[PDB]
A and B are shown apart, each in its own frame.
Chain A
Amino acid sequence: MALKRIHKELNDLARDPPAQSRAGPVGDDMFHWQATIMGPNDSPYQGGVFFLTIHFPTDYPFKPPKVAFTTRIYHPNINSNGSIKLDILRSQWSPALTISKVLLSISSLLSDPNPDDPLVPEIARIYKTDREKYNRIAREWTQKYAM
């Protein structure tokens, strides 16, 4: 069941790339994928290429995939271990969601952080009180780790 739906998504992702991202299986293993996502245009991550790892549970699509950044990034909702603060990855998951929709969601979150429910409280604080500094540091980290 999971395997069948997982090749289905592979085609759909190849034919219709979500938000300047690329994604596919780690060689033979269909339950482990690598992805890249581009920093959104006119975000401070612009120009960056960010690596993601994706692990599908055995009972996918009824349980969410595990999705994490492996590229360091400066963002209130993504922590130093690359965990991503998206409801759909945790409690709001539904089998009507897809990896394409997750990648779309990641892109939207990069463009518009949610500092009120952060994974990194101090970065959220900077985002709120000194956005110029947040943009500067986000850009610096993009230049250092993703470019």
Chain B
Amino acid sequence: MQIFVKTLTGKTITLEVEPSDTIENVKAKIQDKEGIPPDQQRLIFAGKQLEDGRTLSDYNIQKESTLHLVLRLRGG
């Protein structure tokens, strides 16, 4: 299943995921493509910041959903 992760500047990341994937797994996948460590990623869907311990199904995230990636960097 494909989902899209968009950054504030309008970059689109496409990820191959499963509904059973946890937010933490999703962050890891984002890390492999974009080099951003999970700890400094925030993922938002439908206005809510997603929690690492929940799944995509938990938040009712479906095929070709768009998630927003917010970076909260160290020393920032």
Residues of A within 8 A of B (CB): 85, 87-88, 90-92, 94, 96-97, 101, 104-105, 108, 111-112, 114, 116-117
Contact = CB atoms under 8 A, between A and B. Distances in A.
B8 A105 contact: yes
Nearest to B8: A101
B76 A91 contact: yes
Contacts of A108: 44, 49, 70
A87 B10 contact: no
A121 to B, nearest CB: 14
B71 A87 contact: yes
Contacts of A91: 76
A105 B10 contact: no
Contacts of B44: 108
Interface of B is mostly: loop
B60 interface: no
Contacts of B47: 111
6 interchain residue pairs of minimum CB distance: A96-B9, A112-B49, A114-B72, A87-B76, A117-B76, A94-B9
Interface of A is mostly: loop
Contacts of B70: 105, 108
7 contacts: A88-B8, A90-B76, A97-B9, A105-B70, A111-B49, A116-B74, A117-B75
Interface of B: 8-10, 42, 44, 47, 49, 70-76
Nearest to A90: B76
Contacts of A101: 8
B50 to A, nearest CB: 10
Contact of B42 (A90, A96, A112, A117): A112
Given A108-B44, A112-B49, A85 B76 contact: yes
Contacts of B76: 85, 87, 90-91, 117
A26 to B, nearest CB: 26
A117 B16 CA distance: 31
Nearest to A93: B9
Contacts of B73: 87, 92, 117
